[PDB]
Write a protein that holds these residues in place. Structure first.
Motif, mmCIF file in Angstrom:
data_model
loop_
_atom_site.group_PDB
_atom_site.id
_atom_site.type_symbol
_atom_site.label_atom_id
_atom_site.label_comp_id
_atom_site.label_asym_id
_atom_site.label_seq_id
_atom_site.Cartn_x
_atom_site.Cartn_y
_atom_site.Cartn_z
ATOM 1 N N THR A 59 -6.208 10.848 -17.549
ATOM 2 C CA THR A 59 -5.619 11.709 -16.764
ATOM 3 C C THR A 59 -6.674 12.679 -16.297
ATOM 4 O O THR A 59 -7.639 13.049 -16.927
ATOM 5 C CB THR A 59 -4.636 12.584 -17.358
ATOM 6 O OG1 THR A 59 -3.695 11.641 -18.108
ATOM 7 C CG2 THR A 59 -3.924 13.766 -16.312
ATOM 8 N N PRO A 60 -6.835 12.752 -14.870
ATOM 9 C CA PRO A 60 -7.891 13.648 -14.294
ATOM 10 C C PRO A 60 -7.631 15.127 -14.505
ATOM 11 O O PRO A 60 -6.468 15.355 -15.169
ATOM 12 C CB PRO A 60 -7.534 13.504 -12.729
ATOM 13 C CG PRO A 60 -6.729 12.279 -12.729
ATOM 14 C CD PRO A 60 -5.948 12.076 -13.780
ATOM 15 N N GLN A 61 -8.709 15.828 -14.411
ATOM 16 C CA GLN A 61 -8.536 17.155 -14.747
ATOM 17 C C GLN A 61 -8.602 18.067 -13.504
ATOM 18 O O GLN A 61 -8.881 17.510 -12.350
ATOM 19 C CB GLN A 61 -9.989 17.587 -15.568
ATOM 20 C CG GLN A 61 -9.916 16.683 -16.738
ATOM 21 C CD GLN A 61 -11.002 17.214 -17.833
ATOM 22 O OE1 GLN A 61 -11.474 16.436 -18.760
ATOM 23 N NE2 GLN A 61 -11.155 18.401 -17.724
ATOM 24 N N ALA A 62 -8.548 19.577 -13.463
ATOM 25 C CA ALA A 62 -8.886 20.325 -12.308
ATOM 26 C C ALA A 62 -9.923 20.147 -11.675
ATOM 27 O O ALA A 62 -9.998 20.126 -10.305
ATOM 28 C CB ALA A 62 -8.561 21.731 -12.741
ATOM 29 N N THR A 63 -11.128 19.897 -12.206
ATOM 30 C CA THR A 63 -12.520 19.666 -11.652
ATOM 31 C C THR A 63 -12.760 18.299 -11.307
ATOM 32 O O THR A 63 -13.878 17.967 -10.667
ATOM 33 C CB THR A 63 -13.571 20.208 -12.793
ATOM 34 O OG1 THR A 63 -13.319 19.514 -14.032
ATOM 35 C CG2 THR A 63 -13.317 21.621 -13.100
ATOM 36 N N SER A 90 -7.020 19.215 -5.970
ATOM 37 C CA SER A 90 -7.334 18.970 -7.299
ATOM 38 C C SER A 90 -6.976 19.761 -8.369
ATOM 39 O O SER A 90 -5.963 19.639 -9.284
ATOM 40 C CB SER A 90 -8.865 18.578 -7.600
ATOM 41 O OG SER A 90 -9.005 17.225 -7.162
ATOM 42 N N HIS A 91 -7.204 21.181 -8.064
ATOM 43 C CA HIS A 91 -6.574 22.207 -8.901
ATOM 44 C C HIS A 91 -5.032 22.373 -9.205
ATOM 45 O O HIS A 91 -4.512 22.601 -9.845
ATOM 46 C CB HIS A 91 -7.340 23.557 -8.513
ATOM 47 C CG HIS A 91 -8.676 23.944 -8.939
ATOM 48 N ND1 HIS A 91 -9.845 23.036 -8.708
ATOM 49 C CD2 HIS A 91 -8.944 24.532 -10.344
ATOM 50 C CE1 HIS A 91 -10.778 23.371 -9.528
ATOM 51 N NE2 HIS A 91 -10.310 24.004 -10.257
ATOM 52 N N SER A 92 -4.618 22.152 -7.650
ATOM 53 C CA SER A 92 -3.053 22.183 -7.523
ATOM 54 C C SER A 92 -2.433 21.068 -8.358
ATOM 55 O O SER A 92 -1.591 21.244 -9.171
ATOM 56 C CB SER A 92 -2.588 22.278 -6.243
ATOM 57 O OG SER A 92 -1.288 22.329 -6.299
ATOM 58 N N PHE A 93 -2.942 19.883 -8.189
ATOM 59 C CA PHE A 93 -2.402 18.692 -8.948
ATOM 60 C C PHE A 93 -2.557 18.820 -10.461
ATOM 61 O O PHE A 93 -1.524 18.724 -11.208
ATOM 62 C CB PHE A 93 -3.020 17.512 -8.719
ATOM 63 C CG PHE A 93 -2.689 16.820 -7.142
ATOM 64 C CD1 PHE A 93 -1.499 16.676 -7.133
ATOM 65 C CD2 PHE A 93 -3.711 16.313 -6.349
ATOM 66 C CE1 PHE A 93 -1.010 15.935 -5.759
ATOM 67 C CE2 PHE A 93 -3.476 15.671 -5.331
ATOM 68 C CZ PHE A 93 -1.839 15.350 -4.958
ATOM 69 N N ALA A 94 -3.638 19.569 -11.103
ATOM 70 C CA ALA A 94 -3.707 19.590 -12.361
ATOM 71 C C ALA A 94 -2.735 20.803 -13.051
ATOM 72 O O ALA A 94 -2.221 20.625 -13.988
ATOM 73 C CB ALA A 94 -5.006 20.170 -12.705
ATOM 74 N N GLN A 95 -2.236 21.827 -12.037
ATOM 75 C CA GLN A 95 -1.171 22.479 -12.415
ATOM 76 C C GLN A 95 0.012 21.903 -12.591
ATOM 77 O O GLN A 95 0.858 22.196 -13.602
ATOM 78 C CB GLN A 95 -1.017 23.711 -11.318
ATOM 79 C CG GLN A 95 -2.053 24.929 -11.473
ATOM 80 C CD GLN A 95 -2.081 25.913 -10.584
ATOM 81 O OE1 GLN A 95 -1.173 26.877 -10.595
ATOM 82 N NE2 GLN A 95 -3.081 26.073 -9.582
ATOM 83 N N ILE A 96 0.470 20.952 -11.707
ATOM 84 C CA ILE A 96 1.623 20.220 -11.758
ATOM 85 C C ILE A 96 1.860 19.336 -12.774
ATOM 86 O O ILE A 96 2.514 19.229 -13.367
ATOM 87 C CB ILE A 96 1.803 19.411 -10.520
ATOM 88 C CG1 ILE A 96 1.985 20.174 -9.123
ATOM 89 C CG2 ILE A 96 3.259 18.555 -10.626
ATOM 90 C CD1 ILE A 96 2.549 21.589 -9.099
ATOM 91 N N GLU A 97 0.586 18.786 -13.251
ATOM 92 C CA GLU A 97 0.311 17.931 -14.463
ATOM 93 C C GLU A 97 0.514 18.628 -15.677
ATOM 94 O O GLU A 97 1.514 18.042 -16.605
ATOM 95 C CB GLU A 97 -0.993 17.034 -14.224
ATOM 96 C CG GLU A 97 -1.162 16.333 -15.678
ATOM 97 C CD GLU A 97 -0.378 15.166 -15.844
ATOM 98 O OE1 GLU A 97 0.119 14.689 -14.876
ATOM 99 O OE2 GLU A 97 -0.152 14.613 -16.846
#
Length: 401
Positions: free
Chosen positions: A2-6, A95-102
């Motif tokens: 799973t990717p991360q915010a960064t 990427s940061h927004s996707f991480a928040q959804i994840e």
């Protein structure tokens, strides 16, 4: 993994590519994403959603408002999908927004488009916007964008984008699109040949139906937009189809937002979208257009007729489109065909295109086709690149736009 915010945005898109509304709704509720701005316009339709939205955006920005637009698909960059103040955000913000959804979704599975839709809402929410414009992905009733209660909803056009199938017609398509309407809210219909199902859904929902050629209309050295006994006269002609600009004005009218003459005229003069009858060069005229069904092809043929030399078309399409219909329509004005495959199991081969044509050239890829058309072209010719977002994107990449 799973990717991360960064993580790079590309790593997020790979993760998502490997993934009714109850699931996407539940996540939006957890993250308080249902109210991205105080005014929300949701725009459905087969064709013309993009240029309707870009006209709304241009006028609203000219009015000094903070505006976000969610659109899909994209040409070259995923970041095209979320515009704020007319501009794309950094990959890092995505990427940061996707991480928040994840993190936010917990155990609930989401599709690629649901995930991207929730990410957009999260980006819009943070941006302190006045108005958010949501282009529907597909259909209406079951689209991820339909979790948001809009202030005004619109249908731009009804057309068949796919081949013959039982129960598949203007009525069935219309019914699903009318799912974006809301009780007690304006339901703007910019399709002049409206299927009855749209009126039936609007009626079941209690929406206020406002149809082109009934509630409002337009005519075309400017143009005029009329609603009842009131009109805007001598408007500047925008670089989008007038039907879509007119639908945008109807949305704006029924929203009851205060809008100056200056904001309307400046927005109309600014409105345009890449790959929507986009002139990229002259002598020869090179036009890029994402048309991929017969209705879009009809508009393209009409425009080509008034820019009047041979018309050379560089074409690539997805295999599930109405290829026979689209190519029959384009064939009314196209003199010379340059066919290319699109990659993947979803892409039609050049042979699949050529079987519908008589004299067609076949090439290894779209860039090669395009380069040959430009070599062949005389100064008086028109080269049109069309058939798919993918076809247009391949030429834009070759041109480094």
């Amino acid at each position: 993994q799973t990717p991360q915010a960064t993580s790079p945005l590309a790593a997020w898109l790979c993760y998502l590519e490997h993934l009714g509304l109850e699931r996407v709704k539940q996540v939006a509720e957890r993250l308080d994403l249902l109210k991205p701005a105080p005014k929300i316009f949701t725009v459905a339709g087969t064709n013309g959603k993009g240029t309707t939205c870009c006209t709304l955006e241009a006028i609203l920005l000219a009015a000094g408002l903070r505006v976000g637009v969610y659109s899909s698909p994209h040409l070259l960059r995923y970041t095209e999908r979320v515009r704020i103040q007319g501009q794309e955000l950094s990959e890092a913000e995505h990427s940061h927004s996707f991480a928040q959804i994840e993190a936010g979704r917990g155990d609930i599975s989401l599709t690629y488009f649901e995930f991207g839709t929730l990410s957009a809402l999260q980006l819009f929410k943070q941006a302190k916007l006045d108005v958010v414009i949501l282009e529907v992905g597909l259909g209406g009733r079951l689209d991820a964008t339909n979790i948001v209660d809009s202030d005004v909803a619109a249908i731009t056009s009804i057309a068949l984008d796919h081949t013959d199938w039982l129960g598949y017609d203007r009525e069935s398509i219309g019914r699903e699109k009318a799912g974006v309407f809301r009780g007690g809210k304006p339901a703007v219909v910019g399709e002049p040949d409206m299927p009855q199902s749209i009126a039936d859904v609007a009626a079941e929902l209690g929406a206020q139906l406002y149809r082109r050629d009934v509630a409002w209309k337009f005519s075309q050295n400017g143009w005029h937009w009329q609603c009842g006994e009131r009109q805007l006269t001598g408007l500047p002609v925008p670089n989008v189809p007038l039907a879509n600009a007119a639908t945008a004005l109807a949305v704006l009218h029924y929203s009851e937002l205060p809008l100056s003459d200056e904001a309307i005229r400046q927005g109309l003069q600014a409105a345009s979208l890449p790959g929507r009858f986009q002139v990229v060069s002259e002598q020869p005229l090179l036009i890029l257009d994402v048309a991929h069904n017969p209705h879009a092809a009809r508009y393209l043929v009409n425009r080509l007729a008034q820019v009047i030399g041979k018309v050379r078309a560089v074409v690539g399409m997805l295999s599930d489109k109405d290829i026979a219909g689209t190519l029959a329509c384009l064939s009314e004005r196209v003199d010379e065909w340059y066919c290319a495959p699109l990659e993947g199991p979803r892409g039609a081969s050049a042979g699949q295109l050529a079987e519908h044509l008589v004299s067609a050239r076949q090439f290894s890829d779209v860039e090669t086709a395009w380069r040959q058309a430009m070599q062949d072209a005389d100064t008086q010719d028109v080269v049109i690149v069309c058939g798919s977002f993918h076809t247009v994107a391949h030429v834009m990449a070759a041109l480094h736009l």
